[PDB]
Structures are given as structure tokens and as C-alpha cells.
Design a protein around this nucleic acid. Sequence first.
RNA 1: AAAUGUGAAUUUUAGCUAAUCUCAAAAAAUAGGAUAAAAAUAUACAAGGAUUGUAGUCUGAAAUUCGACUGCAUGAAUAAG
Lengths: 408, 223, 80
Amino acid sequence: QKLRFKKTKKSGKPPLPGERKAYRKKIVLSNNNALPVPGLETLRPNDLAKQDNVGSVKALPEDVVDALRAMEAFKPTQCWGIFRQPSVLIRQETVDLTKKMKAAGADGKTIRMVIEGNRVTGKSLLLLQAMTHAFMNDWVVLHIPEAQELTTAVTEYAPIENSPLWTQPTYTLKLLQSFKRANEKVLSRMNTVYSHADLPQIIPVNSPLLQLINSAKEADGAWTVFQALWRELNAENVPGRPPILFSLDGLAHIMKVSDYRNPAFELIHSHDLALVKLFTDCLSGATVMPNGGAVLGATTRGNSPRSASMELAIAQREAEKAGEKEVPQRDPYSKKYDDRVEAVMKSVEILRLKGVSKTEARGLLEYWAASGMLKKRVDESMVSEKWTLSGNGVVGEMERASLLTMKA
Amino acid sequence: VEVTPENAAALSQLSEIAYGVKAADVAIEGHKYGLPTLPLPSELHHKYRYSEVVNHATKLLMKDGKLSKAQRDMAMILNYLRSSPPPKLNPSRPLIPGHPPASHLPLNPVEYLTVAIDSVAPLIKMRGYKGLAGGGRSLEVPQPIPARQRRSTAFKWILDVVNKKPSKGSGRTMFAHRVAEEIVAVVEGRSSVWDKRMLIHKLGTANRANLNSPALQLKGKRF
Amino acid sequence: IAAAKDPKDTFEDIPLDTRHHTFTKKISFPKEWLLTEERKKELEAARQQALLKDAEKVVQGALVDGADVVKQYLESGAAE
RNA sequence: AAAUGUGAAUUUUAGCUAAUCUCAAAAAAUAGGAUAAAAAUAUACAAGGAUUGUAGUCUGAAAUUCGACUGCAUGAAUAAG
Ligand SMILES: Nc1ncnc2c1ncn2[C@@H]1O[C@H](COP(=O)(O)OP(=O)(O)OP(=O)(O)O)[C@@H](O)[C@H]1O
Ligand SMILES: [Mg+2]
Ligand SMILES: [Mg+2]
Ligand SMILES: [Mg+2]
Ligand SMILES: [Mg+2]
Ligand SMILES: [Mg+2]
Ligand SMILES: [Mg+2]
Ligand SMILES: [Mg+2]
Ligand SMILES: [Mg+2]
């Protein structure tokens, strides 16, 4: 037999389920070591629309942070836990978008816009400012934190009888639970006006609308309750129905063929998912909002596929706005386009985000310095240095060069 | 007292030359916006832009020439120390003299790291002479070590304790936060590296007489 | 040329296919940066507005300096 | 380049015998994202890709002794010595 040498064979409590995932996804919104910035004002109900506030940093109210936190508006990749109080930079792009939401909700119209930009320019956070203006002005915010959770086939899905659509019960349930906490104040003032026959429970007309949402205790009847809720919020002629802000982050995920498989093992299109089929209809104008509001779709660059149809549409809409007689056209021999993506994006408005101005960059640096997190003399010579290293004022890059450095 | 250009620099004490409003004459003075005062601060040399301790400790995290990763880890460590509560110094483990109070370390994460490394770093090293203590045994003799050797030994002990600890969470901050927590345990005196520091110091005191041993002075003088 | 003149099929339905060719994009120095007599006046304005913006704060004592902010906070016994 | 095939590859040759045309695309990195009681409590058997079955492709009279790759299935040791 073999005589060679062989190494003969031969601690702590392990984490609980979901503990690891919750570690890399928790959001810290304070730092006791950070200094309280003197003169830091809080956002009034009408501060994200004043032209004079451009370039100034203001703190978010306490109740707003509870609502924004409820619907997962903050993200771990963002630098919030470095300062004491969550504050945002009122930006010239914020006043533009907000002034439209203000007029839209007042005139009963609906703005259907798409936000675009570079890797980290403030797309995801420009929505956080749109939702902030919505909560403070008594709107109904329906936010979808990550659009990749609806397309990457990571949640339960079931078909609808006699239709090509597909529902996602486990996600729709979780979506209602977070919809209550965020809009608890606005919903408390509204009651039902229609007779919903099929529901997990009996609900008479003229009852607390918040009761209708509490019927969805199981994932099965989750979608049915949602459609009923959607009918109430969009009551044609009912006093007290506020505008609706239907926002979605990661637009590039719902503009392609999803990863789900139908019984024939054929990829399901993202626009067939009942929940995604609702946002695209509101974004395309097919489904009208009688009370008005805004439908905002923000793209993303971190973990985002490329859809030539969306990129072409965004390019065509910007060309028509500029007035160019010639508009980008399809590549007559490319097979990466999607007719349905073109139809949805055929009338939306584009909002390109780029680096901030040197005046806004100062207001953001002074806030970091006042908090003791940037030990430098904030002057024109220092603002232009950070403004240059950040690639013409890209807010995302300006943080890595000032806050996430190893020099202080 | 409204300020205007004709009186801005006069009333604000700012140099118009530094701002380029009234530049100098290049054909005569050679410059256009003033000359930097020499000698320059050490931090302005692109090879010495980071602190000596931070730059030295960063490259000890590096593996396989991945300096960009180690630089982001050191940035996460200094960010963790900056968000942690002030430490509670232990009188049994006196830090290096002259350090700032514990209340100042959080806002100064670089000093937080420096005070930690310079506090557990040993002051001596044990060198052995082959076959001079008896029947084939070596003669261990202590000797002092420069700063870079003190910090290198210290931070390598910290990384040795870190690698052996179990995993806690997920993401890109696992290793960074795991190291930062050990940096805090050192300043609070409840770390394991303090034992390794005292263990090597005992060998020095237990062998302080070997500096003049008969074997070390009779190598080839007993023909 | 004879086949091109053939009126049988003009192939107008077929778009010109240029996938065999790799188009190259060239970059040029921005013409807005050329230091002309008009731009010199533009810089003088920016160079002067910078001095005013800082001068206004130095007088009002609003020029932020992160170094001194942290120092005073630690020396004012406010950090417990 | 186009077309065909899940893939190896095939069909057909535009150009170049070359700082011109072609092989040809760098990867690590950078930035996001997913997965954890990520093997020792057997209803939670990790990572791993050896061994073998089977269906194919390319080169060449010729691939059995005895070639190189591809698809599907199989899923060994291996706790850093
Ligand atoms: N107005 C602002 N005020 C303060 N900080 C901001 C502001 N806008 C953006 N930031 C910061 O800039 C960084 C990137 O912002 P954000 O995450 O919104 O970018 P993004 O466009 O959504 O990126 P991606 O394409 O990867 O999804 C974050 O740290 C964010 O806090
Ligand atoms: Mg985003
Ligand atoms: Mg990574
Ligand atoms: Mg080819
Ligand atoms: Mg090759
Ligand atoms: Mg393991
Ligand atoms: Mg496996
Ligand atoms: Mg063979
Ligand atoms: Mg080995």
C-alpha cells in the first residue's frame, strides 16, 4: 500500500437569517460626533420651489425622514451617516422639477418626466426631493425603491386568468405596508366612494380608506386590494383627492425583457408584469390621473443594463426640445430595439442632470466644513479645486474627494 | 458698510494678486500670482501627501499591488472611527504621553489611528546569537527599533487579530469595519495586542544582562 | 455601373448598411478657451467677482474654515 | 462584415501580404448589485471541478490503443498543509 505522508484529518454563535443582508442595507442618518451646523434651516412646505434657495443646504423635517425612510428613499451608497441631521442641497434642478409638480397638482394636469445623468449626479436623490415636496404638500407618494426587484426574478409571481399579465403578490403586499406608514396622515382624511365586491373582507362605501389597505393581510389578495386602492385615489370627481406622485428608480430595468419564465419557458416582458404595466401606462399617458400629479422615472448607472430603445427615446426627446430639425433615428440594421419601449417613451419629458455650479458647490462644501468633516478654508481657491476634481461639479464625485478621503 | 471692488481688498485684507485682479509682471518678477512660500509643507509633495502613519499603515493592508482597494479600506476605517463614540481610556493601559484627550480622537481619525499604533508598538526587539547560551541554545539580546519598525510590528499584530475573527455581515465594509473595531479596542485597553506587547517587553527585562554576556565578548578570544 | 442603372430593382427599400466600417470620432481643442481680447474681459469679470464674494464673507465673518471650527469646538469644552 | 447554431463552429469571402487591412477583444482595476447559521445540530451537506456516461465540432487517409475543444448529465478528494 501507499507509504507517503498524509496530513490526518482534524467557535461562535452564527448570525440569524437576514442579519447579514440587513447589515449592508441599513441606513444611518446621524452622527453624534459631527458638529451641529449653526444657522441650518429646515425645509418649509414651499422651500424646494423658491428660486432664492438655490445653492443653500437645508435640513429635512423629522416627520419627512420617517416617511422617506418608510418607502426606502435613502440608500446605503449615499453619505448620510457622516453628518448629524439629514440635509439636502436645494439645486437649480430641484426648483425646476418642483415648480412643475406645484403647477401640475394645482391645475389637475400630470407631468410625465424621466431623469437622466452620469454615474452619480443626483438622479436617485432628485426623487428624494420630489417625494419630500410631495409629503410636505399633502400628496400621495407611491415610490418603487428598486426596479431590479421587479425584473430580476427574485420575488414570487403568478399569472392572471384570461390575460397575459403577471402579478407579484409578495411584493405588492410589502408595497402596501410601506404605503400606509408614509401616507398615514393623508390617507386618514380620505374614505372609500366605490363598492369593491371582491376583497379579503367586506367594506361598505364611505369607510376609512385606511381600513381598505389593512384588508391585505396575506400576499394572495394583495394585488386585488391594490387595484381597488388605485381606483379610490383616482376618483374622477371627489373632493379631497390629492395629486399622486408615482415614482420609480432604475428605469432601465423595466425597459427590456424580464428574467421571469412563463410555463413555456419563454422570457416574460417587463411590461407584462401587472405592477410594471401600471407604471408604464401612467408614464405613457394611457392611464390618466383625474386628480393630476407627476410620474417620474429615474434611470441608474450602478447595476443597470443597456436598452437601446430607452437611450434612443431619451435622445429623440432632447432633440425635439432643442428644436433640431434632424432627430436621432433607429439603426436600420440593429436588432436591440423594442417597439413597446418606444411607445411608452414617445411623449415623456427629459431632465438631464450634470455637475452643480460653482455657487452650489460652495454651499455644499461650507455645510461639510461647518460639520467638522472638511478641515479646510472654504474659499474660491478651494471651491474651484473640488469643483475641478469632481469633473465639473458632479456631486457624487465631489464627496469621494472631500468626505471619503484618507487625508483627514 | 457695503463692500465694493475699489475697497474690497483694502477692507478684506485679501491679496488682489492672489485672485488675479491685479496680476504681477511676468516679464520682470517671473510670476503672475505670487510665489509659494518656501520651504513647502511636507504634504504638498505628491509622494508624501498622506500622513506618515496613514500611508505606512495603508500599504500594510495592500495585497497583490491593489493599492486602490487598500486606500479605500483605510478611508472606511477613518470613516468608522469618525462615527464611533469617544473611547474610554483604561488607566492600566496608559497611551503614549502627549496624546490628546479621548474626546478629540473621533473628529481627528488620523490621530485616533496614530495614537493607537504608537501606543501598542513595542520599544525593543529580540535578536538571537546562534549557539552562545549553552548546549546549542541561542543568546537572546534586546535592542531598540526605529519608529517605522515599531509601527510596522504594531499594525501587523492588529491585522493578525483581525484575520482570525469571524465574519459578521456583508458588503464592501466587512474588512474595513472589522479592522476599525480592533483599533478602538486598542485605545480602550481591552485588545489582545496589549498582551503581545507586554510579552515581548518581559523578554527584554529578563535578558537585560545579556548585553555584556561572556559569550558575546569571547567569540574568538580564547585560542 | 450597368447593374446600378438597371431600373428593375432600385433597392431604395434597403437602407445603406455601414456595419463593415468603424467610424472614428476626433476631439478638438475647445474654441471657447482661446484667449482672445473678448475672453480676457470675461476672465477679468470672473476673477473680480471671486474677490468680492470672498471679501463679503471675510467682513461679515462668514468665511467657513473647517480647521478652526473643529479646534474651537474641542477647546470650548463642548465635547464633554 | 453579414447570416446560421445554446455552444465548439459553419456558410460566404471584403480588405491586406501590411505604421494602411486582419488576428483584436486587454484583464486586474474603478463603480454598483445578488447570495449566508455560505461545511462541524443531517429536514440547512459550503466552495470545488477530478472521475465517468452521452451527444457533437475541428484538423487529418486515419482520432481504437492515442489528439484538441463544445453541450447535457455525473459531482471525487480538498478545513491552507
Ligand atoms: N442635492 C444633494 N445634496 C446633497 N447631496 C447630494 C445631493 N445630490 C446628490 N447628493 C449625493 O451625491 C451622491 C450620489 O447621489 P445619487 O445616489 O442620488 O446619484 P444617482 O444618479 O442616483 O446614481 P446611480 O446612477 O448610480 O443610481 C450621494 O452621496 C448623494 O448624497
Ligand atoms: Mg440611482
Ligand atoms: Mg467591488
Ligand atoms: Mg465575424
Ligand atoms: Mg489571439
Ligand atoms: Mg465558511
Ligand atoms: Mg456546489
Ligand atoms: Mg480518444
Ligand atoms: Mg502550502
